Structure 1
Amino acid sequence: QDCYHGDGQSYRGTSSTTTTGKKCQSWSSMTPHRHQKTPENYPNAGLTMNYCRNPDADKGPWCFTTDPSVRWEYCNLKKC
């Protein structure tokens, strides 16, 4: 099962697609979106490849988007 539990900071699945069906930008890529959500900045977060994560304590997993126009979105993951 690829779901999450409550806030999903726990998650470590390899779901890398947006809520709207967009590819997730890779965490360390500063293209298209430059940001500070790097493993250098969050060594415990699991800010690997381009999978949905929660380095910020948000309500659920998300990622930056490869759509230059859409900086970030929630992930297409379910609460389990």
Structure 2
Amino acid sequence: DCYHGDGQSYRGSFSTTVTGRTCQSWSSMTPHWHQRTTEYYPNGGLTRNYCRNPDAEIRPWCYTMDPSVRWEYCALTQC
């Protein structure tokens, strides 16, 4: 799947970064503590560890399960 524009409306299930890393679940503060949660982004579709763009980034992204890599853009292409 691909995203349109900045991907703020992307609701797919892709969960892999541009370096092949697995996205961290949005509801998790582990390994990375953060504030991109449904509490603060109720319209963001912050579901499981799905690639999302809740904060008007240029493209969908996620926190990563690698403790040494906080966040990355997802390996999704623009439509």
Normalising by the residue count of structure 2, what TM-score does the alignment of the two structures yield? 0.98
1:49 is displaced (CA, Å) by 0.3
Residues 1-22 of structure 1, C-alpha deviations (whole Å, 9 max, x = no match): x100110001000000001000
More strand by share: 2
Inter-partner Cα distance in structure 2 for 1:37 and 1:59: 16
Pairing 1:1-80 to 2, within 5 Å after superposition = 2-80=1-79
Inter-partner Cα distance in structure 2 for 1:14 and 1:77: 11
1:43 is displaced (CA, Å) by 0.4
Which consecutive residues of structure 2, in runs of 5 or more, have no partner in the other structure? none
What letter corresponds to residue 66 of structure 2 in structure 1?
A: D
Residues 22-78 of structure 1, C-alpha deviations (whole Å, 9 max, x = no match): 000000111000000000111000001000000110100000001000000000001
Output the aligned Cα RMSD.
0.5
User: Between Structure 1 and Structure 2, how many residues are aligned?
Assistant: 79
After TM superposition, the runs of 4+ consecutive aligned structure 1 residues lying more than 4 A away are none
